[PDB]
Design a protein around this motif. Structure first.
Motif, PDB file in Angstrom:
ATOM      1  N   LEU A   1      13.947  14.797  59.715  1.00  0.00           N
ATOM      2  CA  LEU A   1      12.754  15.706  60.369  1.00  0.00           C
ATOM      3  C   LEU A   1      12.186  14.988  61.566  1.00  0.00           C
ATOM      4  CD1 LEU A   1      11.779  18.307  58.933  1.00  0.00           C
ATOM      5  CD2 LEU A   1      13.134  16.765  57.404  1.00  0.00           C
ATOM      6  N   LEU A   2      12.039  13.687  61.554  1.00  0.00           N
ATOM      7  CA  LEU A   2      11.508  12.846  62.650  1.00  0.00           C
ATOM      8  C   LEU A   2      12.453  13.110  63.798  1.00  0.00           C
ATOM      9  CD1 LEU A   2       9.808   9.221  62.120  1.00  0.00           C
ATOM     10  CD2 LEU A   2      11.263   9.904  64.088  1.00  0.00           C
ATOM     11  N   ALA A   3      13.592  12.806  63.825  1.00  0.00           N
ATOM     12  CA  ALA A   3      14.487  13.129  64.857  1.00  0.00           C
ATOM     13  C   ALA A   3      14.603  14.428  65.653  1.00  0.00           C
ATOM     14  CB  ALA A   3      15.895  12.561  64.577  1.00  0.00           C
ATOM     15  N   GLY A   4      14.420  15.385  64.785  1.00  0.00           N
ATOM     16  CA  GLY A   4      14.359  16.594  65.332  1.00  0.00           C
ATOM     17  C   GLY A   4      13.425  17.116  66.152  1.00  0.00           C
ATOM     18  N   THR A   5      11.975  16.288  66.005  1.00  0.00           N
ATOM     19  CA  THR A   5      10.714  16.407  66.743  1.00  0.00           C
ATOM     20  C   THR A   5      11.094  15.840  67.961  1.00  0.00           C
ATOM     21  OG1 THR A   5       9.949  16.401  64.439  1.00  0.00           O
ATOM     22  CG2 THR A   5       8.391  16.458  66.397  1.00  0.00           C
ATOM     23  N   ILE A   6      11.541  14.891  68.295  1.00  0.00           N
ATOM     24  CA  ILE A   6      11.266  14.212  69.397  1.00  0.00           C
ATOM     25  C   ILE A   6      12.427  14.747  70.433  1.00  0.00           C
ATOM     26  CG2 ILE A   6      10.234  12.090  68.718  1.00  0.00           C
ATOM     27  CD1 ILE A   6      12.763  10.652  67.886  1.00  0.00           C
ATOM     28  N   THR A   7      13.570  15.226  70.227  1.00  0.00           N
ATOM     29  CA  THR A   7      14.588  15.925  71.291  1.00  0.00           C
ATOM     30  C   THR A   7      14.562  17.253  71.359  1.00  0.00           C
ATOM     31  OG1 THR A   7      16.465  16.407  69.556  1.00  0.00           O
ATOM     32  CG2 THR A   7      15.997  14.034  69.775  1.00  0.00           C
ATOM     33  N   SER A   8      14.035  18.021  70.426  1.00  0.00           N
ATOM     34  CA  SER A   8      13.915  19.405  70.560  1.00  0.00           C
ATOM     35  C   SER A   8      12.873  20.069  70.534  1.00  0.00           C
ATOM     36  CB  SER A   8      15.262  19.989  69.501  1.00  0.00           C
ATOM     37  OG  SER A   8      14.736  19.635  68.216  1.00  0.00           O
ATOM     38  N   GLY A   9      11.693  19.392  70.101  1.00  0.00           N
ATOM     39  CA  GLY A   9      10.257  19.839  70.135  1.00  0.00           C
ATOM     40  C   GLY A   9      10.125  20.664  68.917  1.00  0.00           C
ATOM     41  N   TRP A  10       9.635  21.881  68.948  1.00  0.00           N
ATOM     42  CA  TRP A  10       9.588  22.693  67.688  1.00  0.00           C
ATOM     43  C   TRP A  10      10.835  23.630  67.622  1.00  0.00           C
ATOM     44  CZ3 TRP A  10       5.468  23.033  71.584  1.00  0.00           C
ATOM     45  CH2 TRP A  10       5.553  24.464  72.147  1.00  0.00           C
ATOM     46  N   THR A  11      11.573  23.829  68.612  1.00  0.00           N
ATOM     47  CA  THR A  11      12.506  24.840  68.482  1.00  0.00           C
ATOM     48  C   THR A  11      13.470  24.723  67.331  1.00  0.00           C
ATOM     49  OG1 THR A  11      13.562  23.602  70.334  1.00  0.00           O
ATOM     50  CG2 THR A  11      12.487  25.611  71.002  1.00  0.00           C
ATOM     51  N   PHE A  12      13.630  23.387  66.728  1.00  0.00           N
ATOM     52  CA  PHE A  12      14.577  23.559  65.609  1.00  0.00           C
ATOM     53  C   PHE A  12      14.045  23.963  64.452  1.00  0.00           C
ATOM     54  CE2 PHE A  12      13.315  19.994  62.700  1.00  0.00           C
ATOM     55  CZ  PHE A  12      12.051  19.628  63.162  1.00  0.00           C
ATOM     56  N   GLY A  13      12.682  24.479  64.273  1.00  0.00           N
ATOM     57  CA  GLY A  13      12.074  25.170  63.332  1.00  0.00           C
ATOM     58  C   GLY A  13      12.570  26.743  63.030  1.00  0.00           C
ATOM     59  N   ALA A  14      12.445  27.589  64.205  1.00  0.00           N
ATOM     60  CA  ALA A  14      12.887  28.779  64.092  1.00  0.00           C
ATOM     61  C   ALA A  14      14.394  29.093  64.022  1.00  0.00           C
ATOM     62  CB  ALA A  14      12.291  29.539  65.368  1.00  0.00           C
ATOM     63  N   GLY A  15      14.925  28.556  64.948  1.00  0.00           N
ATOM     64  CA  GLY A  15      16.414  28.599  64.909  1.00  0.00           C
ATOM     65  C   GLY A  15      17.296  27.768  65.265  1.00  0.00           C
ATOM     66  N   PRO A  16      18.302  27.808  66.305  1.00  0.00           N
ATOM     67  CA  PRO A  16      19.137  26.815  66.833  1.00  0.00           C
ATOM     68  C   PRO A  16      18.423  25.834  67.580  1.00  0.00           C
ATOM     69  CG  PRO A  16      20.103  28.673  67.132  1.00  0.00           C
ATOM     70  CD  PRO A  16      18.479  29.218  67.053  1.00  0.00           C
ATOM     71  N   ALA A  17      18.702  24.480  67.503  1.00  0.00           N
ATOM     72  CA  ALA A  17      17.869  23.454  68.385  1.00  0.00           C
ATOM     73  C   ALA A  17      18.273  23.271  69.719  1.00  0.00           C
ATOM     74  CB  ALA A  17      18.160  21.970  67.599  1.00  0.00           C
ATOM     75  N   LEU A  18      17.206  23.354  70.621  1.00  0.00           N
ATOM     76  CA  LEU A  18      17.304  23.234  72.029  1.00  0.00           C
ATOM     77  C   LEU A  18      16.728  22.016  72.494  1.00  0.00           C
ATOM     78  CD1 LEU A  18      15.990  26.929  72.064  1.00  0.00           C
ATOM     79  CD2 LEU A  18      18.125  26.478  71.943  1.00  0.00           C
ATOM     80  N   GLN A  19      17.616  21.326  73.381  1.00  0.00           N
ATOM     81  CA  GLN A  19      17.162  19.729  73.614  1.00  0.00           C
ATOM     82  C   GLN A  19      15.872  20.055  74.882  1.00  0.00           C
ATOM     83  OE1 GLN A  19      21.157  20.386  74.692  1.00  0.00           O
ATOM     84  NE2 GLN A  19      21.142  19.090  76.690  1.00  0.00           N
ATOM     85  N   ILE A  20      15.262  18.910  74.967  1.00  0.00           N
ATOM     86  CA  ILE A  20      14.007  19.327  75.929  1.00  0.00           C
ATOM     87  C   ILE A  20      13.557  17.962  76.236  1.00  0.00           C
ATOM     88  CG2 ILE A  20      12.301  19.599  74.106  1.00  0.00           C
ATOM     89  CD1 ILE A  20      10.789  21.313  76.129  1.00  0.00           C
ATOM     90  N   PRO A  21      13.337  17.229  77.411  1.00  0.00           N
ATOM     91  CA  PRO A  21      12.825  16.148  77.560  1.00  0.00           C
ATOM     92  C   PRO A  21      11.263  15.753  76.898  1.00  0.00           C
ATOM     93  CG  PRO A  21      13.796  16.803  79.501  1.00  0.00           C
ATOM     94  CD  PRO A  21      13.583  17.943  78.674  1.00  0.00           C
ATOM     95  N   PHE A  22      10.821  14.703  76.659  1.00  0.00           N
ATOM     96  CA  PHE A  22       9.679  14.348  75.948  1.00  0.00           C
ATOM     97  C   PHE A  22       8.526  14.630  76.909  1.00  0.00           C
ATOM     98  CE2 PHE A  22       6.858  11.885  73.213  1.00  0.00           C
ATOM     99  CZ  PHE A  22       6.994  12.670  71.998  1.00  0.00           C
ATOM    100  N   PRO A  23       8.543  14.285  78.206  1.00  0.00           N
ATOM    101  CA  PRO A  23       7.380  14.516  78.936  1.00  0.00           C
ATOM    102  C   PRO A  23       6.936  16.042  79.101  1.00  0.00           C
ATOM    103  CG  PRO A  23       8.695  12.704  79.998  1.00  0.00           C
ATOM    104  CD  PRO A  23       9.583  13.199  78.814  1.00  0.00           C
ATOM    105  N   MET A  24       8.260  16.708  79.115  1.00  0.00           N
ATOM    106  CA  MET A  24       8.169  18.268  79.327  1.00  0.00           C
ATOM    107  C   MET A  24       7.434  18.704  77.859  1.00  0.00           C
ATOM    108  SD  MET A  24      11.117  19.337  81.627  1.00  0.00           S
ATOM    109  CE  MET A  24      10.182  20.755  81.777  1.00  0.00           C
ATOM    110  N   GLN A  25       8.153  18.235  76.747  1.00  0.00           N
ATOM    111  CA  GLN A  25       7.353  18.645  75.724  1.00  0.00           C
ATOM    112  C   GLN A  25       5.787  18.506  75.216  1.00  0.00           C
ATOM    113  OE1 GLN A  25       8.022  17.486  70.790  1.00  0.00           O
ATOM    114  NE2 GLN A  25       9.808  16.995  72.250  1.00  0.00           N
ATOM    115  N   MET A  26       5.631  17.203  76.021  1.00  0.00           N
ATOM    116  CA  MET A  26       4.087  16.707  75.727  1.00  0.00           C
ATOM    117  C   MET A  26       3.171  17.720  76.689  1.00  0.00           C
ATOM    118  SD  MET A  26       2.161  14.793  74.150  1.00  0.00           S
ATOM    119  CE  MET A  26       2.132  13.754  72.648  1.00  0.00           C
TER     120      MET A  26
END
Ligand SMILES: *[C@@H]1O[C@H](CO)[C@@H](O[C@@H]2O[C@H](CO)[C@@H](O)[C@H](O)[C@H]2NC(C)=O)[C@H](O)[C@H]1NC(C)=O
Ligand SMILES: *[C@@H]1O[C@H](CO)[C@@H](O[C@@H]2O[C@H](CO)[C@@H](O)[C@H](O)[C@@H]2O)[C@H](O)[C@H]1NC(C)=O
Ligand SMILES: *[C@@H]1O[C@H](CO)[C@@H](O[C@@H]2O[C@H](CO)[C@@H](O)[C@H](O)[C@@H]2O)[C@H](O)[C@H]1NC(C)=O
Ligand code: NAG
Ligand code: NAG
Lengths: 49, 80, 39
Positions: free
Chosen positions: A6-31
């Motif tokens: 759960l913790l590693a899904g949050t820092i590399t894919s934002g919240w997109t791993f909740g709805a469906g497939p996990a999509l990568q995104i940089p942490f500055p952009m997620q913030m």
């Protein structure tokens, strides 16, 4: 192990791993997204990172 | 009844797009590139668009944004 | 050909992500799923 997953899904894919497939995104952009959620524009984060 | 995305595709991003001494952050959506030219598209679908001055709001100095990328933005006022 | 076996549980399918400084993944298609819930 479940907590680590759960913790590693949050820092590399934002919240997109909740709805469906996990999509990568940089942490500055997620913030920047999370800041935009509050009601403050992205430029404030990009100036005071 | 729910909505679920599918069929992802890798791309290249950039926090901002630096025109003449400015920053030009996007208004809504990421700044993605095919491999050559930059586009602004939504977050949950793929609808690329040209980087025109109405899709982006500008505030900065092209110095403090880390990871900025050089490209030219367009405006519908210079032509007319 | 039939029997009872004992195994340790599998928490889930092994998967890894591809984080990088500049990479996005934008879906280009969707689906509609109708689930059910009973109370
Ligand atoms: C991105 O563009 C800017 C300006 O558009 C470039 O800034 C140049 O910086 C050098 C070094 O100070 C100057 O000699 C040039 O005159 C600047 N360009 C202009 C048009 O004034 C910057 O180098 C570009 N970055 C990359 C990686 O190409
Ligand atoms: C970047 O995005 C371009 C869209 O404007 C793609 O350009 C293509 O260019 C050829 C001619 O060189 C056209 O015939 C074609 O219709 C398309 O516009 C380009 O493919 C794309 N980059 C990559 C790596 O796919
Ligand atoms: C998004 O996904 C749809 C199904 O999940 C695709 O629809 C399919 O279309 C084919 C014909 O091309 C049918 O045979 C099939 O039964 C299904 O309806 C749809 O094409 C797809 N979108 C894209 C752009 O690929
Ligand atoms: C993006 O590239 C990585 C590199 O291996 C790959 O594992 C991943 O599946 C790609 N994302 C796609 C194809 O959506
Ligand atoms: C991201 O940038 C840092 C800058 O120090 C670099 O060390 C790192 O290798 C970069 N990421 C990748 C995947 O190369």
């Amino acid at each position: 192990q479940y907590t680590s997953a759960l913790l590693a899904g949050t820092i590399t894919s934002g919240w997109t791993f909740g709805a469906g497939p996990a999509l990568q995104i940089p942490f500055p952009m997620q913030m920047a997204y999370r800041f935009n959620g509050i009601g403050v524009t992205q430029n404030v984060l990009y100036e005071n990172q | 009844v729910t909505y679920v995305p599918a069929q992802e595709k890798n791309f290249t991003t950039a926090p901002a797009i630096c025109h003449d001494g400015k920053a030009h952050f996007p208004r809504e959506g990421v700044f993605v590139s095919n491999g050559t030219h930059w586009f602004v598209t939504q977050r949950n679908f793929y609808e690329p668009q040209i980087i025109t001055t109405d899709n982006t709001f500008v505030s900065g100095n092209c110095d403090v944004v880390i990871g900025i990328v050089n490209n030219t933005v367009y405006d519908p006022l210079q032509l007319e | 050909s039939q029997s009872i076996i004992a195994y340790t549980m599998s928490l889930g399918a092994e998967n890894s992500v591809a984080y990088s400084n500049n990479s996005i993944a934008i879906p280009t298609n969707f689906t509609i799923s109708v689930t059910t819930e009973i109370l």
